[PDB]
Amino acid sequence: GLTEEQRMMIRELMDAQMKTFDTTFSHFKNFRLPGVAKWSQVRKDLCSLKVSLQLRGEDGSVWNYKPPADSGGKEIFSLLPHMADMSTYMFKGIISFAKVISYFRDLPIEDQISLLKGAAFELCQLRFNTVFNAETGTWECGRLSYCLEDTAGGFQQLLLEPMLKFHYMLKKLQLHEEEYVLMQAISLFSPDRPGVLQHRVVDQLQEQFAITLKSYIECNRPQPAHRFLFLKIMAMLTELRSINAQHTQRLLRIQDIHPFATPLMQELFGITGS
């Protein structure tokens, strides 16, 4: 079954998640909002986001934003300031998650920074899948809601952008909170990240989290639908890392044309300021 050590690993991760995941986004406030040539062509990477924004007030008021269509203009950058603020809020939560976990704290500062930089996007996306509604194509973030706008091919066309397909595929697995936090742990403690000194310790931690995840699934999911779940999750994690490397390249190209990264995002991506 589950060993007490395995049950102590899950509890440590689960408590770290509860303390640092504001699932209602109640402290996300004071954020920016959109106002009331091969480089540029590629930089039209932005069209795959296609998101509408809803902001519900406590008074009952609802503000709704619909994005501009591309007209060969700067209007494509209208939502980047808001998204940078949301990304920064999510990343701060992820940093707090790592810092409250005993195993991460024990690691050297240099390794802690290297691991956070490598896994920050992946951990944020894993948390965002918990708030994603597959039926509505919407990410429900407290009073903010982010809805995918209609596209010609509809669902299938959205499933062509890897980030979106990841979200739909992961949600279909119908994971428990314990399985999400183990995926975060496996992704955070990745030994093959640039700059990791204590690779052997990190690799052993990762294997223990994966063993714990495999054991959790074996003990709590006996149904033929959950056959090969551990391996599906591990493949998902491998795809997320490829998505992460692609997203980094897309982001840095936009930044090069149209700077928008916040200070914390600049630190994450090694932008110096000079």
Ligand SMILES: O=S(=O)(c1ccccc1)N(Cc1ccc(Oc2ccccc2)cc1)c1ccc(C(O)(C(F)(F)F)C(F)(F)F)cc1
């Ligand atoms: O993948 S989503 O859900 C998404 C959102 C909208 C349309 C399609 C897909 N996402 C949310 C998200 C937020 C944070 C994150 O982790 C990061 C951690 C540190 C630094 C950067 C990211 C990962 C996903 C999303 C949000 C923004 C972006 C951007 O590339 C954008 F803005 F240039 F499109 C940018 F620049 F803001 F990061 C991409 C995906």
